[PDB]
């Protein structure tokens, strides 16, 4: 995962079956008061999806080509965020990322890093 | 306009005629891989510029409902980033944002903060 592969803002992602997972705790300044900065959420969805992508091809370096995020609901501060990832297609993976506290959904195209 | 309205990561955005515009300087640690800029940070700056752009155009607090982003090229580190917004339609603005050093095209649907 990010420990098997280095100088980014990449969170630990893991396998939970065919799906992947991450957990994150926003520091108090990571605000939007009482709510989580919407750009962090994209930061986390983005590194998880790329990580998820690396795993799937492993079963290799990947980069985001496209990232689409629906913000479904305000994300409360002071709560652990959990990220779930679904592999929809496997040099390029397609991943669906769900972030809960559901607050935000991502559809992500990762390709092999050129 | 963020000095017009406070505890986010919102960047100084301004009118550029009919377009809006902003500039940003990544900190040395905001890397992706060496030599380039973290994608989360890039997605973060489109979001706050796009929302900033939204509030000015409607004139009010706006939030992102959807943000779609295509990563057109790697973003070099140590150079000032320029963000320009296109207002595509105006309690809901649709905005097109371009970050340069063109490195990424973002599409935003912003709605009034509920």
UniProtKB/TrEMBL annotation, chain A:
<dbReference type="InterPro" id="IPR006683">
    <property type="entry name" value="Thioestr_dom"/>
</dbReference>
<dbReference type="GO" id="GO:0016790">
    <property type="term" value="F:thiolester hydrolase activity"/>
</dbReference>
<dbReference type="InterPro" id="IPR029069">
    <property type="entry name" value="HotDog_dom_sf"/>
</dbReference>
<feature type="domain" description="Thioesterase">
    <location>
        <begin position="34"/>
        <end position="101"/>
    </location>
</feature>
<protein>
    <submittedName>
        <fullName>Thioesterase superfamily protein</fullName>
    </submittedName>
</protein>
<dbReference type="Pfam" id="PF03061">
    <property type="entry name" value="4HBT"/>
</dbReference>
């Amino acid at each position: 995962f990010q420990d098997a592969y280095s100088h980014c803002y990449g969170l630990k992602s893991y396998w939970r079956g065919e799906q992947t997972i991450a957990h994150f705790m926003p520091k108090p300044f990571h605000t939007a008061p009482g709510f989580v900065y919407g750009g962090l959420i994209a930061s986390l969805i983005d590194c998880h999806g790329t990580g998820s992508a690396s795993a799937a091809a492993q079963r290799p370096r990947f980069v985001t080509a496209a990232l689409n995020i629906d913000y479904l609901a305000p994300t409360p501060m002071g709560v652990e965020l959990e990220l779930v990832g679904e592999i929809k297609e496997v040099r390029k993976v397609v991943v669906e990322i769900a972030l809960s506290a559901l607050c935000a959904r991502g559809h992500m195209v990762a390709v092999k890093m050129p």
